Amino acid sequence: QDNSRYTHFLTQAYDAKPQGRDDRYCESIMRRRGLTSPCKDINTFIHGNKRSIKAICENKNGNPHRENLRISKSSFQVTTCKLHGGSPWPPCQYRATAGFRNVVVACENGLPVHLDQSIFRRP
């Protein structure tokens, strides 16, 4: 169906209006979206307009990146939550990192179904 993935993706990485973009916000949204027990070691939420996000999938806001992905032409506001400590069990310990940059996504029939996170593990 022309949902699932696109719709899973939104549930996973989309948050239009984040209140705080801090540790507190990271732990509260993570717990709330149900990405704990055991906690996801890393996760980024894209903030902003949905339409612009969808355009990354066309040659209008995106470009072929790597073998089969697409990098955005425009920049986005984003918040990355990285689990820390050494225990993936609650209380989950997250550290928040806010940014503004281009993003890489996977598209499937004109729709994004995955937010690639390798550019967010900046080593």
Swiss-Prot record:
Alphabetical UniProt keywords: Amyotrophic lateral sclerosis, Angiogenesis, Cytoplasm, Developmental protein, Differentiation, Disease variant, Disulfide bond, DNA-binding, Endonuclease, Hydrolase, Neurodegeneration, Nuclease, Nucleus, Protein synthesis inhibitor, Pyrrolidone carboxylic acid, Secreted, Signal, Stress response
Modified residues annotated as Pyrrolidone carboxylic acid in this record: Q1
Keyword Plastid: no
GO cellular component entries: actin cytoskeleton; angiogenin-PRI complex; basement membrane; chromosome; cytoplasm; cytoplasmic stress granule; cytosol; endocytic vesicle
Its EC number(s): 3.1.27.-
Disulfide cysteine pairs (residue numbers): C26-C81, C39-C92, C57-C107
Active site: A13, H114
Effect of substituting N68D: Abolished binding to PLXNB2 receptor
Residues annotated for tRNA binding in this entry: R21, D22, C81, V103
Principal EC category: hydrolase
Subcellular location field: Secreted; Nucleus; Nucleus, Nucleolus; Cytoplasm, Stress granule
Effect of R95Q: Found in a patient with Parkinson disease; uncertain significance
Superkingdom, taxonomy of origin: Eukaryota
UniProt motif Nucleolar localization signal: location: 31-35
Result of altering K40E: In ALS9; uncertain significance
Function: Secreted ribonuclease that can either promote or restrict cell proliferation of target cells, depending on the context. Endocytosed in target cells via its receptor PLXNB2 and translocates to the cytoplasm or nucleus. Under stress conditions, localizes to the cytoplasm and promotes the assembly of stress granules (SGs): specifically cleaves a subset of tRNAs within anticodon loops to produce tRNA-derived stress-induced fragments (tiRNAs), resulting in translation repression and inhibition of cell proliferation. tiRNas also prevent formation of apoptosome, thereby promoting cell survival.
Name of the protein described by the UniProt record: Angiogenin
Native source species: Homo sapiens (Human)
Taxonomic placement: Eukaryota, Metazoa, Chordata, Craniata, Vertebrata
Residue span relative to the full protein: 25 to 147 of 147
